[PDB]
Amino acid sequence: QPLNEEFRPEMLQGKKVIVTGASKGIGREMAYHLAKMGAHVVVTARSKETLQKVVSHCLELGAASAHYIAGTMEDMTFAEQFVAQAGKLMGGLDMLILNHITNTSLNLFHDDIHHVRKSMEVNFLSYVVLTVAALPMLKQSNGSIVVVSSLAGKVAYPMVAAYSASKFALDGFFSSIRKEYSVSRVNVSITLCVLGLIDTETAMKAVSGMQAAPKEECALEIIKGGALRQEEVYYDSSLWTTLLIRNPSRKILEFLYSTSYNMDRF
Amino acid sequence: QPLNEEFRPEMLQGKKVIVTGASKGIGREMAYHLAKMGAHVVVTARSKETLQKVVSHCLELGAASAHYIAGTMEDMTFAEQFVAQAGKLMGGLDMLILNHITNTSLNLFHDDIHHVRKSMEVNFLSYVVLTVAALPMLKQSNGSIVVVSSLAGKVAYPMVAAYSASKFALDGFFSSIRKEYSVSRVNVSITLCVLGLIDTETAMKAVSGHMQAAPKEECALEIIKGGALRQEEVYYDSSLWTTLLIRNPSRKILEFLYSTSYNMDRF
Ligand SMILES: NC(=O)c1ccc[n+]([C@@H]2O[C@H](COP(=O)([O-])OP(=O)(O)OC[C@H]3O[C@@H](n4cnc5c(N)ncnc54)[C@H](OP(=O)(O)O)[C@@H]3O)[C@@H](O)[C@H]2O)c1
Ligand SMILES: NC(=O)c1ccc[n+]([C@@H]2O[C@H](COP(=O)([O-])OP(=O)(O)OC[C@H]3O[C@@H](n4cnc5c(N)ncnc54)[C@H](OP(=O)(O)O)[C@@H]3O)[C@@H](O)[C@H]2O)c1
Ligand SMILES: C[C@](O)(c1ccc(C(=O)N(C2CC2)[C@H]2CC[C@](O)(C3CC3)CC2)cc1)C(F)(F)F
Ligand SMILES: C[C@](O)(c1ccc(C(=O)N(C2CC2)[C@H]2CC[C@](O)(C3CC3)CC2)cc1)C(F)(F)F
């Protein structure tokens, strides 16, 4: 159930977020916005020298507080422990924003199984492990998990097979536990963000060789959705998608199945 | 794009087909239907005994031939070589049917990342591995890859998170490379089967305590029908509401409002 207010920067002030993939692009902007709202941010990325710059410029923008921990999400242990640390560092946690991904480029898929596996590992399994680790704290606070996905995690695009596989997976997994949290009275929201082409560095480089959209706002929308506990956010420069992307039938089928079968079965 | 005729059992006659998870359940039914049709058949699962039951019955039903090879699709090496063996045993491959999943049961998700990882490995990664290994023969025959899925890989459900993740992923991957096969002019069909509850042994066991299951035998027949006709998806569920609502014609619109709306010559 979305909080039925409208968004206001106040909602974030004093709140204990975590952004991953915060060293650049969308993730970075998010830490900043968070900063401008006076959140306790705890950033993360592989780039340790760069994280500092970001933390530092977050304190400059107004953060209640701001730290970074640098690790690779290829590593499940790092991911798990990371969350504990960001905990102690911030004295609990209100919001897990899960944004990072492994590198990829635009190519037909031919036989790089290793790239498929790694994409699943970094883009998906790590998100879960982050999740499992962070759930306890979030229960205490009735917090939120925000998950950054893409049009290509809703509809099919060539040249990004591995990456799509992993974005879909996020939908499947997280929508599913959303059903579960609900039939279990576990009061943690989960927001899935579906983004179109955004003007990050990485994206602009790979496509340079379509209309992109402003990374500053995209990041703000992500934060709004999360704050308002919406199930979903759509953010694309086009106006067909925002309207054609939503799946009313899916919603109907879920409704039917949910109100027709207790889940109190066990 | 599909064949333009209604289905005929003949279409499978002489065809060479792999079926996985074919010792029991929907797999087994698929072997059986294939046999009655006179296709060569290689079936695989972990248990050599149950397989043997099945190979022996496909022979009696009038397979052109029928064999089995055992291993677990937890093992990528096995998955890769498995397809080579099977291709030798038949001198080719017309259809790759991907059906197996890791044993899983109905539970709230709590902890078991290992179950999340294993489900991704078996239900998803192994399929990519199988396809990669089989694509050279499939090109050569202009055949078909059939990927077995579930309503829960098109909409959310409680109690099957891990599984559902792995099924969505199948939609993402396989629907993406289908878009690729189109622009690379690869003449191999990809069919994604979306299944509601099916009265297989294992499913019925898990749901013993009002849910309407659909019949394994017809289900298995629809999959093979959608495959042979090279359709993009097959929906099969006991409910007509569901079979109608599950379609997503918008999504096919967006995908097309980009297909032509942009250029893939570079790649
Ligand atoms: N930009 C778009 O057009 C587009 C479209 C739709 C959705 N999105 C989504 O937006 C989110 C962020 O994308 P973006 O464009 O901001 O990407 P980006 O600029 O390329 O940033 C990726 C972030 O994740 C980090 N990262 C990369 N590999 C990592 C690893 N192995 N372990 C830990 N961190 C790693 C990177 O920093 P380090 O290398 O320093 O670790 C960086 O901070 C992604 O989920 C993406 O799918 C982007
Ligand atoms: N029944 C349903 O309600 C339902 C609904 C939607 C979709 N589906 C899809 O239907 C497909 C078939 O399901 P089913 O219900 O027919 O299942 P099933 O009868 O339980 O069959 C599972 C098959 O997979 C094999 N298998 C299990 N683990 C394996 C492994 N590690 N490596 C290789 N093979 C393995 C099993 O044999 P061994 O144990 O001998 O290894 C068996 O042959 C699945 O993809 C499922 O998601 C089923
Ligand atoms: C990692 C990287 O930045 C990236 C950036 C954006 C996306 C993404 O989410 N896309 C869908 C639109 C939202 C892209 C948009 C760009 C295109 O349509 C390609 C086909 C011509 C692919 C789909 C995926 C990866 C990459 F790959 F460019 F490096
Ligand atoms: C492994 C197993 O056979 C299985 C069989 C079927 C499915 C499946 O695809 N389902 C969707 C409808 C198609 C299930 C139907 C069963 C339920 O709705 C659960 C909530 C009570 C879950 C969704 C998943 C797993 C199991 F777990 F039942 F044994």
Side-chain angles (χ1 to χ4, degrees), chain B residues 21 23 25-26 46-47 72-73 99 101 149-150 163 167 195 197-198 200 202:
Chain B
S23 62
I26 290 156
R46 284 170 310 190
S47 307
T72 159
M73 293 289 189
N99 166 82
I101 53 154
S149 200
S150 157
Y163 166 94
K167 294 283 169 169
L195 305 198
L197 178 68
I198 310 292
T200 67
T202 307

mmCIF file with all atom_site columns, all heavy atoms in Angstrom, chain B residues 21 23 25-26 46-47 72-73 99 101 149-150 163 167 195 197-198 200 202, ligand 2:
data_model
loop_
_atom_site.group_PDB
_atom_site.id
_atom_site.type_symbol
_atom_site.label_atom_id
_atom_site.label_alt_id
_atom_site.label_comp_id
_atom_site.label_asym_id
_atom_site.label_entity_id
_atom_site.label_seq_id
_atom_site.pdbx_PDB_ins_code
_atom_site.Cartn_x
_atom_site.Cartn_y
_atom_site.Cartn_z
_atom_site.occupancy
_atom_site.B_iso_or_equiv
_atom_site.pdbx_formal_charge
_atom_site.auth_seq_id
_atom_site.auth_comp_id
_atom_site.auth_asym_id
_atom_site.auth_atom_id
_atom_site.pdbx_PDB_model_num
ATOM   1   N N   . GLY B 1 21  ? 14.374 -33.495 -18.389 1.00 0.00 ? 21  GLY B N   1
ATOM   2   C CA  . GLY B 1 21  ? 13.435 -33.838 -17.340 1.00 0.00 ? 21  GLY B CA  1
ATOM   3   C C   . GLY B 1 21  ? 12.352 -34.741 -17.900 1.00 0.00 ? 21  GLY B C   1
ATOM   4   O O   . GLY B 1 21  ? 11.165 -34.481 -17.714 1.00 0.00 ? 21  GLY B O   1
ATOM   5   N N   . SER B 1 23  ? 11.903 -38.191 -17.405 1.00 0.00 ? 23  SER B N   1
ATOM   6   C CA  . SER B 1 23  ? 11.718 -39.478 -16.731 1.00 0.00 ? 23  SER B CA  1
ATOM   7   C C   . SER B 1 23  ? 10.298 -39.553 -16.202 1.00 0.00 ? 23  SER B C   1
ATOM   8   O O   . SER B 1 23  ? 9.695  -40.619 -16.208 1.00 0.00 ? 23  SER B O   1
ATOM   9   C CB  . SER B 1 23  ? 12.745 -39.699 -15.596 1.00 0.00 ? 23  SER B CB  1
ATOM   10  O OG  . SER B 1 23  ? 12.643 -38.723 -14.564 1.00 0.00 ? 23  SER B OG  1
ATOM   11  N N   . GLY B 1 25  ? 6.576  -36.766 -15.200 1.00 0.00 ? 25  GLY B N   1
ATOM   12  C CA  . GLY B 1 25  ? 5.893  -35.534 -15.512 1.00 0.00 ? 25  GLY B CA  1
ATOM   13  C C   . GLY B 1 25  ? 5.677  -35.192 -16.963 1.00 0.00 ? 25  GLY B C   1
ATOM   14  O O   . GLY B 1 25  ? 5.528  -36.072 -17.805 1.00 0.00 ? 25  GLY B O   1
ATOM   15  N N   . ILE B 1 26  ? 5.645  -33.887 -17.240 1.00 0.00 ? 26  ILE B N   1
ATOM   16  C CA  . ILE B 1 26  ? 5.378  -33.323 -18.559 1.00 0.00 ? 26  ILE B CA  1
ATOM   17  C C   . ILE B 1 26  ? 6.430  -33.783 -19.568 1.00 0.00 ? 26  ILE B C   1
ATOM   18  O O   . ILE B 1 26  ? 6.111  -34.048 -20.730 1.00 0.00 ? 26  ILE B O   1
ATOM   19  C CB  . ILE B 1 26  ? 5.314  -31.752 -18.503 1.00 0.00 ? 26  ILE B CB  1
ATOM   20  C CG1 . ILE B 1 26  ? 4.078  -31.280 -17.775 1.00 0.00 ? 26  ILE B CG1 1
ATOM   21  C CG2 . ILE B 1 26  ? 5.222  -31.179 -19.877 1.00 0.00 ? 26  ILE B CG2 1
ATOM   22  C CD1 . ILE B 1 26  ? 4.188  -29.945 -17.191 1.00 0.00 ? 26  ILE B CD1 1
ATOM   23  N N   . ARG B 1 46  ? 18.333 -37.407 -14.241 1.00 0.00 ? 46  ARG B N   1
ATOM   24  C CA  . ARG B 1 46  ? 19.417 -38.005 -13.426 1.00 0.00 ? 46  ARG B CA  1
ATOM   25  C C   . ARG B 1 46  ? 19.329 -39.555 -13.281 1.00 0.00 ? 46  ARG B C   1
ATOM   26  O O   . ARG B 1 46  ? 20.363 -40.246 -13.309 1.00 0.00 ? 46  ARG B O   1
ATOM   27  C CB  . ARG B 1 46  ? 19.490 -37.383 -12.020 1.00 0.00 ? 46  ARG B CB  1
ATOM   28  C CG  . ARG B 1 46  ? 20.122 -35.998 -11.919 1.00 0.00 ? 46  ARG B CG  1
ATOM   29  C CD  . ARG B 1 46  ? 19.898 -35.398 -10.523 1.00 0.00 ? 46  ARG B CD  1
ATOM   30  N NE  . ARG B 1 46  ? 18.490 -35.501 -10.173 1.00 0.00 ? 46  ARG B NE  1
ATOM   31  C CZ  . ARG B 1 46  ? 17.924 -34.917 -9.123  1.00 0.00 ? 46  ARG B CZ  1
ATOM   32  N NH1 . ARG B 1 46  ? 18.648 -34.171 -8.301  1.00 0.00 ? 46  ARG B NH1 1
ATOM   33  N NH2 . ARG B 1 46  ? 16.626 -35.084 -8.896  1.00 0.00 ? 46  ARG B NH2 1
ATOM   34  N N   . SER B 1 47  ? 18.099 -40.079 -13.137 1.00 0.00 ? 47  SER B N   1
ATOM   35  C CA  . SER B 1 47  ? 17.825 -41.497 -12.814 1.00 0.00 ? 47  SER B CA  1
ATOM   36  C C   . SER B 1 47  ? 17.772 -42.418 -14.031 1.00 0.00 ? 47  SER B C   1
ATOM   37  O O   . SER B 1 47  ? 16.841 -42.347 -14.860 1.00 0.00 ? 47  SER B O   1
ATOM   38  C CB  . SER B 1 47  ? 16.513 -41.604 -12.038 1.00 0.00 ? 47  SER B CB  1
ATOM   39  O OG  . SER B 1 47  ? 16.552 -40.732 -10.923 1.00 0.00 ? 47  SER B OG  1
ATOM   40  N N   . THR B 1 72  ? 23.142 -34.889 -14.055 1.00 0.00 ? 72  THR B N   1
ATOM   41  C CA  . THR B 1 72  ? 22.459 -33.765 -13.464 1.00 0.00 ? 72  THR B CA  1
ATOM   42  C C   . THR B 1 72  ? 22.830 -32.456 -14.189 1.00 0.00 ? 72  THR B C   1
ATOM   43  O O   . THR B 1 72  ? 23.985 -32.233 -14.610 1.00 0.00 ? 72  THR B O   1
ATOM   44  C CB  . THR B 1 72  ? 22.838 -33.629 -12.034 1.00 0.00 ? 72  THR B CB  1
ATOM   45  O OG1 . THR B 1 72  ? 22.551 -32.281 -11.625 1.00 0.00 ? 72  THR B OG1 1
ATOM   46  C CG2 . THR B 1 72  ? 24.314 -33.891 -11.914 1.00 0.00 ? 72  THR B CG2 1
ATOM   47  N N   . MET B 1 73  ? 21.839 -31.583 -14.328 1.00 0.00 ? 73  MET B N   1
ATOM   48  C CA  . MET B 1 73  ? 22.040 -30.375 -15.072 1.00 0.00 ? 73  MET B CA  1
ATOM   49  C C   . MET B 1 73  ? 22.593 -29.363 -14.113 1.00 0.00 ? 73  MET B C   1
ATOM   50  O O   . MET B 1 73  ? 22.763 -28.191 -14.457 1.00 0.00 ? 73  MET B O   1
ATOM   51  C CB  . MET B 1 73  ? 20.752 -29.931 -15.705 1.00 0.00 ? 73  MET B CB  1
ATOM   52  C CG  . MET B 1 73  ? 20.277 -30.897 -16.791 1.00 0.00 ? 73  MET B CG  1
ATOM   53  S SD  . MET B 1 73  ? 21.301 -30.855 -18.297 1.00 0.00 ? 73  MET B SD  1
ATOM   54  C CE  . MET B 1 73  ? 20.406 -31.853 -19.472 1.00 0.00 ? 73  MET B CE  1
ATOM   55  N N   . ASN B 1 99  ? 13.043 -28.624 -20.214 1.00 0.00 ? 99  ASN B N   1
ATOM   56  C CA  . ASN B 1 99  ? 11.904 -28.880 -19.373 1.00 0.00 ? 99  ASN B CA  1
ATOM   57  C C   . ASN B 1 99  ? 12.281 -29.108 -17.921 1.00 0.00 ? 99  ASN B C   1
ATOM   58  O O   . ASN B 1 99  ? 11.554 -28.700 -17.023 1.00 0.00 ? 99  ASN B O   1
ATOM   59  C CB  . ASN B 1 99  ? 11.113 -30.030 -20.004 1.00 0.00 ? 99  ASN B CB  1
ATOM   60  C CG  . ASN B 1 99  ? 10.093 -30.629 -19.087 1.00 0.00 ? 99  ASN B CG  1
ATOM   61  O OD1 . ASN B 1 99  ? 8.978  -30.099 -18.932 1.00 0.00 ? 99  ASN B OD1 1
ATOM   62  N ND2 . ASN B 1 99  ? 10.438 -31.778 -18.491 1.00 0.00 ? 99  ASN B ND2 1
ATOM   63  N N   . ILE B 1 101 ? 13.820 -29.027 -14.101 1.00 0.00 ? 101 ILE B N   1
ATOM   64  C CA  . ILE B 1 101 ? 14.030 -28.008 -13.076 1.00 0.00 ? 101 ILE B CA  1
ATOM   65  C C   . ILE B 1 101 ? 14.641 -28.703 -11.856 1.00 0.00 ? 101 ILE B C   1
ATOM   66  O O   . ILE B 1 101 ? 14.624 -29.921 -11.756 1.00 0.00 ? 101 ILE B O   1
ATOM   67  C CB  . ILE B 1 101 ? 12.718 -27.339 -12.617 1.00 0.00 ? 101 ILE B CB  1
ATOM   68  C CG1 . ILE B 1 101 ? 11.696 -28.403 -12.195 1.00 0.00 ? 101 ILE B CG1 1
ATOM   69  C CG2 . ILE B 1 101 ? 12.117 -26.447 -13.712 1.00 0.00 ? 101 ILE B CG2 1
ATOM   70  C CD1 . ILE B 1 101 ? 10.693 -27.881 -11.182 1.00 0.00 ? 101 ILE B CD1 1
ATOM   71  N N   . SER B 1 149 ? 8.003  -23.076 -19.366 1.00 0.00 ? 149 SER B N   1
ATOM   72  C CA  . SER B 1 149 ? 7.838  -22.144 -18.263 1.00 0.00 ? 149 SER B CA  1
ATOM   73  C C   . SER B 1 149 ? 6.467  -22.239 -17.541 1.00 0.00 ? 149 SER B C   1
ATOM   74  O O   . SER B 1 149 ? 5.740  -23.197 -17.709 1.00 0.00 ? 149 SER B O   1
ATOM   75  C CB  . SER B 1 149 ? 8.089  -20.710 -18.768 1.00 0.00 ? 149 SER B CB  1
ATOM   76  O OG  . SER B 1 149 ? 8.396  -19.861 -17.685 1.00 0.00 ? 149 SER B OG  1
ATOM   77  N N   . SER B 1 150 ? 6.098  -21.181 -16.819 1.00 0.00 ? 150 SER B N   1
ATOM   78  C CA  . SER B 1 150 ? 5.002  -21.180 -15.915 1.00 0.00 ? 150 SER B CA  1
ATOM   79  C C   . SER B 1 150 ? 4.376  -19.793 -15.819 1.00 0.00 ? 150 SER B C   1
ATOM   80  O O   . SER B 1 150 ? 5.070  -18.778 -16.006 1.00 0.00 ? 150 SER B O   1
ATOM   81  C CB  . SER B 1 150 ? 5.536  -21.497 -14.543 1.00 0.00 ? 150 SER B CB  1
ATOM   82  O OG  . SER B 1 150 ? 4.622  -21.000 -13.602 1.00 0.00 ? 150 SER B OG  1
ATOM   83  N N   . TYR B 1 163 ? 12.131 -20.018 -7.602  1.00 0.00 ? 163 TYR B N   1
ATOM   84  C CA  . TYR B 1 163 ? 11.709 -20.669 -8.865  1.00 0.00 ? 163 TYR B CA  1
ATOM   85  C C   . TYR B 1 163 ? 11.230 -19.603 -9.831  1.00 0.00 ? 163 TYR B C   1
ATOM   86  O O   . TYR B 1 163 ? 11.497 -19.578 -11.018 1.00 0.00 ? 163 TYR B O   1
ATOM   87  C CB  . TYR B 1 163 ? 10.579 -21.611 -8.494  1.00 0.00 ? 163 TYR B CB  1
ATOM   88  C CG  . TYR B 1 163 ? 9.726  -22.174 -9.601  1.00 0.00 ? 163 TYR B CG  1
ATOM   89  C CD1 . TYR B 1 163 ? 10.033 -23.414 -10.155 1.00 0.00 ? 163 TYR B CD1 1
ATOM   90  C CD2 . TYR B 1 163 ? 8.545  -21.551 -10.009 1.00 0.00 ? 163 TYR B CD2 1
ATOM   91  C CE1 . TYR B 1 163 ? 9.270  -23.969 -11.113 1.00 0.00 ? 163 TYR B CE1 1
ATOM   92  C CE2 . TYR B 1 163 ? 7.769  -22.131 -10.988 1.00 0.00 ? 163 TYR B CE2 1
ATOM   93  C CZ  . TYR B 1 163 ? 8.142  -23.346 -11.527 1.00 0.00 ? 163 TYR B CZ  1
ATOM   94  O OH  . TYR B 1 163 ? 7.427  -23.993 -12.531 1.00 0.00 ? 163 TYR B OH  1
ATOM   95  N N   . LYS B 1 167 ? 12.361 -18.516 -13.597 1.00 0.00 ? 167 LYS B N   1
ATOM   96  C CA  . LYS B 1 167 ? 11.506 -18.578 -14.789 1.00 0.00 ? 167 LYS B CA  1
ATOM   97  C C   . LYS B 1 167 ? 11.400 -17.243 -15.528 1.00 0.00 ? 167 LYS B C   1
ATOM   98  O O   . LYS B 1 167 ? 11.425 -17.219 -16.751 1.00 0.00 ? 167 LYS B O   1
ATOM   99  C CB  . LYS B 1 167 ? 10.114 -19.151 -14.489 1.00 0.00 ? 167 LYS B CB  1
ATOM   100 C CG  . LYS B 1 167 ? 10.118 -20.624 -14.077 1.00 0.00 ? 167 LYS B CG  1
ATOM   101 C CD  . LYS B 1 167 ? 10.300 -21.559 -15.283 1.00 0.00 ? 167 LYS B CD  1
ATOM   102 C CE  . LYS B 1 167 ? 10.568 -22.995 -14.856 1.00 0.00 ? 167 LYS B CE  1
ATOM   103 N NZ  . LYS B 1 167 ? 10.490 -23.929 -16.023 1.00 0.00 ? 167 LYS B NZ  1
ATOM   104 N N   . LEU B 1 195 ? 2.892  -22.235 -18.425 1.00 0.00 ? 195 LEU B N   1
ATOM   105 C CA  . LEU B 1 195 ? 1.979  -23.263 -17.914 1.00 0.00 ? 195 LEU B CA  1
ATOM   106 C C   . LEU B 1 195 ? 1.374  -22.883 -16.595 1.00 0.00 ? 195 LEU B C   1
ATOM   107 O O   . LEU B 1 195 ? 2.113  -22.468 -15.686 1.00 0.00 ? 195 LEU B O   1
ATOM   108 C CB  . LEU B 1 195 ? 2.725  -24.577 -17.684 1.00 0.00 ? 195 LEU B CB  1
ATOM   109 C CG  . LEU B 1 195 ? 3.478  -25.142 -18.874 1.00 0.00 ? 195 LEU B CG  1
ATOM   110 C CD1 . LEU B 1 195 ? 3.807  -26.631 -18.675 1.00 0.00 ? 195 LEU B CD1 1
ATOM   111 C CD2 . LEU B 1 195 ? 2.584  -24.912 -20.077 1.00 0.00 ? 195 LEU B CD2 1
ATOM   112 N N   . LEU B 1 197 ? -0.991 -24.629 -13.260 1.00 0.00 ? 197 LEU B N   1
ATOM   113 C CA  . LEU B 1 197 ? -0.848 -25.878 -12.504 1.00 0.00 ? 197 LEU B CA  1
ATOM   114 C C   . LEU B 1 197 ? -1.212 -27.075 -13.345 1.00 0.00 ? 197 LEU B C   1
ATOM   115 O O   . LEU B 1 197 ? -2.279 -27.113 -13.941 1.00 0.00 ? 197 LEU B O   1
ATOM   116 C CB  . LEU B 1 197 ? -1.768 -25.838 -11.284 1.00 0.00 ? 197 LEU B CB  1
ATOM   117 C CG  . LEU B 1 197 ? -1.835 -27.057 -10.344 1.00 0.00 ? 197 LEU B CG  1
ATOM   118 C CD1 . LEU B 1 197 ? -0.517 -27.238 -9.593  1.00 0.00 ? 197 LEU B CD1 1
ATOM   119 C CD2 . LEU B 1 197 ? -2.950 -26.867 -9.364  1.00 0.00 ? 197 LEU B CD2 1
ATOM   120 N N   . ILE B 1 198 ? -0.314 -28.051 -13.375 1.00 0.00 ? 198 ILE B N   1
ATOM   121 C CA  . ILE B 1 198 ? -0.463 -29.264 -14.172 1.00 0.00 ? 198 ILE B CA  1
ATOM   122 C C   . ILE B 1 198 ? -0.439 -30.521 -13.261 1.00 0.00 ? 198 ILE B C   1
ATOM   123 O O   . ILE B 1 198 ? 0.402  -30.627 -12.333 1.00 0.00 ? 198 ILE B O   1
ATOM   124 C CB  . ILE B 1 198 ? 0.673  -29.343 -15.166 1.00 0.00 ? 198 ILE B CB  1
ATOM   125 C CG1 . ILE B 1 198 ? 0.790  -28.010 -15.903 1.00 0.00 ? 198 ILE B CG1 1
ATOM   126 C CG2 . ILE B 1 198 ? 0.490  -30.512 -16.162 1.00 0.00 ? 198 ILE B CG2 1
ATOM   127 C CD1 . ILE B 1 198 ? -0.354 -27.687 -16.820 1.00 0.00 ? 198 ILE B CD1 1
ATOM   128 N N   . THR B 1 200 ? 0.860  -33.136 -12.655 1.00 0.00 ? 200 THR B N   1
ATOM   129 C CA  . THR B 1 200 ? 1.920  -34.087 -12.550 1.00 0.00 ? 200 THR B CA  1
ATOM   130 C C   . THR B 1 200 ? 1.987  -34.564 -11.101 1.00 0.00 ? 200 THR B C   1
ATOM   131 O O   . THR B 1 200 ? 1.575  -33.881 -10.162 1.00 0.00 ? 200 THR B O   1
ATOM   132 C CB  . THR B 1 200 ? 3.307  -33.515 -12.961 1.00 0.00 ? 200 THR B CB  1
ATOM   133 O OG1 . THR B 1 200 ? 3.733  -32.507 -12.031 1.00 0.00 ? 200 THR B OG1 1
ATOM   134 C CG2 . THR B 1 200 ? 3.292  -32.962 -14.382 1.00 0.00 ? 200 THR B CG2 1
ATOM   135 N N   . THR B 1 202 ? 4.369  -34.713 -8.946  1.00 0.00 ? 202 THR B N   1
ATOM   136 C CA  . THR B 1 202 ? 5.135  -33.939 -7.982  1.00 0.00 ? 202 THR B CA  1
ATOM   137 C C   . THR B 1 202 ? 4.385  -32.716 -7.546  1.00 0.00 ? 202 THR B C   1
ATOM   138 O O   . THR B 1 202 ? 4.461  -32.305 -6.379  1.00 0.00 ? 202 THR B O   1
ATOM   139 C CB  . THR B 1 202 ? 6.408  -33.419 -8.666  1.00 0.00 ? 202 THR B CB  1
ATOM   140 O OG1 . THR B 1 202 ? 7.117  -34.518 -9.290  1.00 0.00 ? 202 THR B OG1 1
ATOM   141 C CG2 . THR B 1 202 ? 7.275  -32.631 -7.693  1.00 0.00 ? 202 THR B CG2 1
HETATM 142 N N1  . LIG C 2 .   ? 3.536  -29.188 -12.705 1.00 0.00 ? 2   LIG C N1  1
HETATM 143 C C1  . LIG C 2 .   ? 3.313  -27.876 -12.656 1.00 0.00 ? 2   LIG C C1  1
HETATM 144 O O1  . LIG C 2 .   ? 2.250  -27.357 -11.906 1.00 0.00 ? 2   LIG C O1  1
HETATM 145 C C2  . LIG C 2 .   ? 4.185  -26.871 -13.396 1.00 0.00 ? 2   LIG C C2  1
HETATM 146 C C3  . LIG C 2 .   ? 3.651  -25.608 -13.578 1.00 0.00 ? 2   LIG C C3  1
HETATM 147 C C4  . LIG C 2 .   ? 4.261  -24.712 -14.431 1.00 0.00 ? 2   LIG C C4  1
HETATM 148 C C5  . LIG C 2 .   ? 5.409  -25.086 -15.097 1.00 0.00 ? 2   LIG C C5  1
HETATM 149 N N2  . LIG C 2 .   ? 5.915  -26.331 -14.922 1.00 0.00 ? 2   LIG C N2  1
HETATM 150 C C6  . LIG C 2 .   ? 7.140  -26.678 -15.637 1.00 0.00 ? 2   LIG C C6  1
HETATM 151 O O2  . LIG C 2 .   ? 7.019  -27.987 -16.099 1.00 0.00 ? 2   LIG C O2  1
HETATM 152 C C7  . LIG C 2 .   ? 8.316  -28.494 -16.167 1.00 0.00 ? 2   LIG C C7  1
HETATM 153 C C8  . LIG C 2 .   ? 8.250  -29.941 -15.771 1.00 0.00 ? 2   LIG C C8  1
HETATM 154 O O3  . LIG C 2 .   ? 7.733  -30.032 -14.440 1.00 0.00 ? 2   LIG C O3  1
HETATM 155 P P1  . LIG C 2 .   ? 6.994  -31.367 -13.883 1.00 0.00 ? 2   LIG C P1  1
HETATM 156 O O4  . LIG C 2 .   ? 5.949  -30.793 -12.997 1.00 0.00 ? 2   LIG C O4  1
HETATM 157 O O5  . LIG C 2 .   ? 6.668  -32.257 -15.006 1.00 0.00 ? 2   LIG C O5  1
HETATM 158 O O6  . LIG C 2 .   ? 8.175  -31.998 -13.015 1.00 0.00 ? 2   LIG C O6  1
HETATM 159 P P2  . LIG C 2 .   ? 8.602  -33.495 -12.608 1.00 0.00 ? 2   LIG C P2  1
HETATM 160 O O7  . LIG C 2 .   ? 7.571  -34.420 -13.132 1.00 0.00 ? 2   LIG C O7  1
HETATM 161 O O8  . LIG C 2 .   ? 8.884  -33.471 -11.151 1.00 0.00 ? 2   LIG C O8  1
HETATM 162 O O9  . LIG C 2 .   ? 9.960  -33.819 -13.405 1.00 0.00 ? 2   LIG C O9  1
HETATM 163 C C9  . LIG C 2 .   ? 11.197 -33.253 -13.062 1.00 0.00 ? 2   LIG C C9  1
HETATM 164 C C10 . LIG C 2 .   ? 12.115 -33.874 -14.076 1.00 0.00 ? 2   LIG C C10 1
HETATM 165 O O10 . LIG C 2 .   ? 13.357 -33.217 -14.027 1.00 0.00 ? 2   LIG C O10 1
HETATM 166 C C11 . LIG C 2 .   ? 14.364 -34.132 -13.710 1.00 0.00 ? 2   LIG C C11 1
HETATM 167 N N3  . LIG C 2 .   ? 15.386 -33.493 -12.887 1.00 0.00 ? 2   LIG C N3  1
HETATM 168 C C12 . LIG C 2 .   ? 15.268 -33.098 -11.573 1.00 0.00 ? 2   LIG C C12 1
HETATM 169 N N4  . LIG C 2 .   ? 16.480 -32.600 -11.194 1.00 0.00 ? 2   LIG C N4  1
HETATM 170 C C13 . LIG C 2 .   ? 17.340 -32.714 -12.245 1.00 0.00 ? 2   LIG C C13 1
HETATM 171 C C14 . LIG C 2 .   ? 18.673 -32.363 -12.409 1.00 0.00 ? 2   LIG C C14 1
HETATM 172 N N5  . LIG C 2 .   ? 19.345 -31.832 -11.390 1.00 0.00 ? 2   LIG C N5  1
HETATM 173 N N6  . LIG C 2 .   ? 19.309 -32.580 -13.603 1.00 0.00 ? 2   LIG C N6  1
HETATM 174 C C15 . LIG C 2 .   ? 18.612 -33.161 -14.649 1.00 0.00 ? 2   LIG C C15 1
HETATM 175 N N7  . LIG C 2 .   ? 17.285 -33.499 -14.483 1.00 0.00 ? 2   LIG C N7  1
HETATM 176 C C16 . LIG C 2 .   ? 16.666 -33.274 -13.302 1.00 0.00 ? 2   LIG C C16 1
HETATM 177 C C17 . LIG C 2 .   ? 13.656 -35.218 -12.916 1.00 0.00 ? 2   LIG C C17 1
HETATM 178 O O11 . LIG C 2 .   ? 14.336 -36.451 -12.953 1.00 0.00 ? 2   LIG C O11 1
HETATM 179 P P3  . LIG C 2 .   ? 15.482 -36.866 -11.864 1.00 0.00 ? 2   LIG C P3  1
HETATM 180 O O12 . LIG C 2 .   ? 15.096 -36.480 -10.460 1.00 0.00 ? 2   LIG C O12 1
HETATM 181 O O13 . LIG C 2 .   ? 15.645 -38.330 -12.230 1.00 0.00 ? 2   LIG C O13 1
HETATM 182 O O14 . LIG C 2 .   ? 16.820 -36.163 -11.939 1.00 0.00 ? 2   LIG C O14 1
HETATM 183 C C18 . LIG C 2 .   ? 12.394 -35.313 -13.716 1.00 0.00 ? 2   LIG C C18 1
HETATM 184 O O15 . LIG C 2 .   ? 12.732 -36.002 -14.893 1.00 0.00 ? 2   LIG C O15 1
HETATM 185 C C19 . LIG C 2 .   ? 9.170  -27.648 -15.214 1.00 0.00 ? 2   LIG C C19 1
HETATM 186 O O16 . LIG C 2 .   ? 10.042 -26.852 -15.974 1.00 0.00 ? 2   LIG C O16 1
HETATM 187 C C20 . LIG C 2 .   ? 8.174  -26.754 -14.553 1.00 0.00 ? 2   LIG C C20 1
HETATM 188 O O17 . LIG C 2 .   ? 8.601  -25.462 -14.098 1.00 0.00 ? 2   LIG C O17 1
HETATM 189 C C21 . LIG C 2 .   ? 5.341  -27.231 -14.086 1.00 0.00 ? 2   LIG C C21 1
#
